[PDB]
């Protein structure tokens, strides 16, 4: 009944209760909650609830642009285009035209790999911290480079250069844009950076890519040729980064200033894109809320989250735990305590978690008040970044199960899990997991729960790869974490096995796989 | 309630302190401290107290852009950039060829304490220090890393008459309260005195924004190297043979930004921001000679502030006075609790940190302490034109719950209550430290700080390049001591630290901080 900013929804439902539908509001009562309605919150002082250029109703009505994603239907979440840059093939020649000694090979660009570069993990987690802290942190704008198809060959022989001349480099890249949030007039600018020493900066400029960028979408369409770095001239090099390049160190490839616009709709008929700008509202938009960021082993993603500073009385805005904000970020359908991607079981204790040093401290000070002691109950402050890291493989002893080959000694007639049944342990378990369902020359970190309800009945387990190791573990009265790291080979190797022995006592269950970076290859 | 200035804030409630709640204002009680809310005052005779755009009532409620810091909420604390540029890599070639390249580290406050002078033994109350030059956190001075002694013309086969190029990599900061929209530097490049070439850079070249405390290059990203530049695209800065020569002895590179242009945000009817036809131009010179300068410098982030200030001479205006503390506790996020403040985990005070006037106000305050009977620098009024700089030490003891040293002080015994602040420390014998030079900057200078008292004579020892010996009587009250001393390159040995006394002596508020760079 009562209206305060320039919103058509009252200031009584502003707060408690937000439905909207058929272009009018009416409040929540929990009873349309299949119906495709959903309770969103937001202020009552400000127009827009973020600083994205919409309002808290025309943002949760759908009468606003239809390209963006429908995450950003909430009002907590803002509308925020963050365009990335993408390599595949490298090709390096001697000659400035565009014949001579040329030689190709195949990379895959990799987005969350130097933000867990700088993790270590513990054999046991103190306290109940189940997460490790990165040495840096980096979004989702740079990327790095790892080659593949590449045999024991020096990048000198192939070329041949002996002392002060050398070759150019020349690249395939593609253009994609991983947030809620399309843009027009698109014109990012990128370097071409070999450990701090930028080689060159790329500009796409407007008629190369198009008046275009949809989110989610790259620019070569899915399936299509990529993009080479001919269509504005060749990049050289000089003979002291050739063998920097061929030793240990990859070429990082990242955005620095990335300028567009963005459509309103009009009085009357279609959306326009001339007077305006993604340029302002970024200022904006950065200042007050979060940073999330999900991996999933197929795409990525990474929205921003308006967070509440606890140091002010005046302030009102809505406040969010971590689990409601990742559901209202995302997207997850709330199973029976879980959390529910499309088909990934993302919740506390079923993925990685990285935060920088300051989110540590925080959420390390947080915790000591906690009456559950679990990560995904703790306030939101403005000012912090979290990545999820979702595993490559992981079962527990349930309905979900995607491990590539199938374990021995498994017994799931039990109820005493930290999620439904577990598995009863008499001896032996082995795990032959062969090298061609593994990327080669990486690194891999192994992560599970334990418990036992006993003194003194302990654990051995053991991984078997080029580096082999040995390890004997003693769990205790409650639910323990354990991670152990190992490295892989290339595609020619045996299989990696993995073999724990018990004593007929102790239960396991959450069993993961998953990737933390690469490492570098003898060349 | 009646208005003088158009701000919708009566003069009653204006002239004593007042809060906004429910976006209305209201009176102090002095019973909103627990809850969270803050006092604040302003001048009645004009609706802009400072000289910023924000009007009283919009800076005082929140009703502002949304990027400026929180701290310039109340409306005695201008808003306004202040943005600067530091160098982090030194590329040199001879082509138009031989190439050198090193790594730099930069300082915003070097040429700050670079005249400052120490004292064995403080001749009054004043308990401070005085530089000779002041330089603010726009000016920035770079030092030059791990060398082995290898000279800067080993590389290069120059001779008398030919022009080496510089190639560096710059990374633009902000120190400030608020956003630079169109940001656009006009750098310059000294050395010794000489400019070797001013830098140019333009609005759709780097990040078009600044927030203020943000980087253009972000935090895991790569520096900007101007090779990527459209007018060093084709040349670079000239070096003759002198100036490398200067270079190879001890003098340094240092960067100072002249002169910034661009505009600020601001509010519509129909959109929401702006940023045409505001401007930054003639607002800069109404806020700098109208206050006063604060400067904080903690171990990983400095900060600048102006806050205005009661004229003394003039009783024609109205703007309210404050005190050192009050100003310092309004400027930054300073929280107080039992008399002390803390600005987020460092300790700020008189007699914890190392603060340091220039020479034109350090005689005011002196003359201003004469008047006072609690003896203490942080209760002297604030007048226009002071320049303040904070300097926290980057190891501090005070033998309580704060501790930063690396190795555990010997022989420390805590059970007493006589001393300055909390408890303090009992020689019955002798104390002694050791730490490493892995924990401490190579080719630095350093100060050692503390407080003595005796209700006999202390002996103290640093090793250090140069090892001293000294001796210090202490009197009855409590007299603040400082030693200095340099150190060495990185692969040398430990520092000792050796306090020997006669046993009935106390010490207390033992602190190291890092003052100045020596020449190699
Ligand atoms: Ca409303
Ligand atoms: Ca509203
Ligand atoms: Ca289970
Ligand atoms: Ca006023
Ligand atoms: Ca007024
Ligand atoms: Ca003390």
């Not at 993009?227 to 063998?243: E, F, G, V």
């Not at 598995?423 to 032959?432: A, Q, R, S, V």
Request: charged content about 25%; hydrophobic content about 30%; proline content about 4%.
């Amino acid at each position: 009944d009562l209206d305060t900013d320039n919103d058509n929804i009252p200031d009584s439902y502003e707060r408690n209760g937000y439905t909207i539908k058929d272009l009018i509001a009416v409040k929540w009562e929990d009873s349309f909650a299949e119906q495709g309605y959903k309770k969103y919150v937001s202020n009552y002082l400000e127009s827009n609830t973020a600083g994205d250029p919409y309002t808290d109703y025309e943002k949760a009505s759908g009468s606003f642009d239809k390209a963006i994603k429908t995450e950003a239907r909430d009002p907590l979440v803002a509308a925020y285009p963050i365009v990335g840059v993408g390599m595949e093939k490298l090709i390096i020649s001697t000659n400035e035209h565009a014949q001579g000694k040329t030689v190709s090979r195949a990379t895959t660009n990799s987005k969350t790999e130097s933000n867990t570069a700088g993790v270590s993990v513990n054999v046991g987690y103190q306290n109940g911290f189940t997460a490790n802290v990165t040495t840096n942190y980096s979004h989702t704008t740079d990327n790095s480079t790892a080659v593949q198809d590449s045999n024991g060959e020096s990048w000198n022989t192939g070329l041949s250069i002996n002392k002060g001349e050398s070759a150019y480099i020349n690249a395939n890249v593609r253009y994609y844009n991983t947030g809620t949030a399309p843009m027009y007039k698109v014109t990012p600018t990128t370097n071409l950076v070999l450990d701090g020493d930028t080689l060159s900066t790329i500009k796409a400029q407007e008629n190369q890519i198009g008046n275009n960028l949809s989110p989610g979408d790259t620019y070569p369409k899915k399936g299509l040729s990529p993009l080479a770095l001919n269509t504005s001239r060749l990049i050289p090099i000089n003979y002291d980064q050739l063998k920097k390049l061929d030793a240990g160190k990859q070429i990082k490839l990242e955005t620095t200033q990335v300028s567009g616009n963005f459509g309103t709709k009009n009085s009357s008929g279609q959306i326009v894109t001339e007077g305006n700008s993604w340029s302002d509202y970024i200022s904006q938009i950065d200042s007050i809320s979060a940073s999330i960021i999900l991996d999933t082993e197929n795409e990525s993603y990474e929205r921003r989250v308006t967070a509440k500073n606890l140091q002010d009385p005046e302030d009102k805005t809505p406040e969010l735990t971590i689990g409601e904000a990742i559901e209202k970020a995302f997207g997850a359908t709330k199973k029976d305590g879980l959390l529910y991607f499309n088909d990934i079981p993302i919740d506390e204790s079923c993925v990685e978690l990285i935060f920088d040093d300051n989110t540590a401290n925080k959420i390390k000070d947080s915790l000591k008040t906690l009456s559950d002691k679990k990560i995904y109950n703790v306030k939101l402050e403005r000012g912090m970044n979290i990545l999820i890291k979702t595993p490559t493989y992981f079962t527990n002893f349930d309905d979900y199960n995607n491990y590539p080959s199938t374990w021995s000694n498994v017994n799931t007639t039990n109820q005493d899990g930290l999620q439904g049944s577990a598995n009863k342990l008499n001896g032996e378990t082995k795990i032959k997991i062969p090298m061609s369902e593994l990327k080669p020359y990486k690194r891999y970190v192994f992560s599970g729960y334990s418990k036992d309800p006993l003194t003194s009945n302990s654990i051995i387990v053991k991984i078997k790869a080029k580096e082999e190791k040995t390890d004997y573990l003693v769990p205790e009265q409650g639910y323990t974490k354990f991670s152990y790291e190992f490295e892989t080979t290339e595609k020619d190797s045996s299989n990696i096995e993995i073999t724990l022995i018990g004593s007929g006592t102790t239960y396991l269950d959450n069993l993961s796989i998953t990737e933390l970076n690469s490492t570098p290859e003898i060349l």
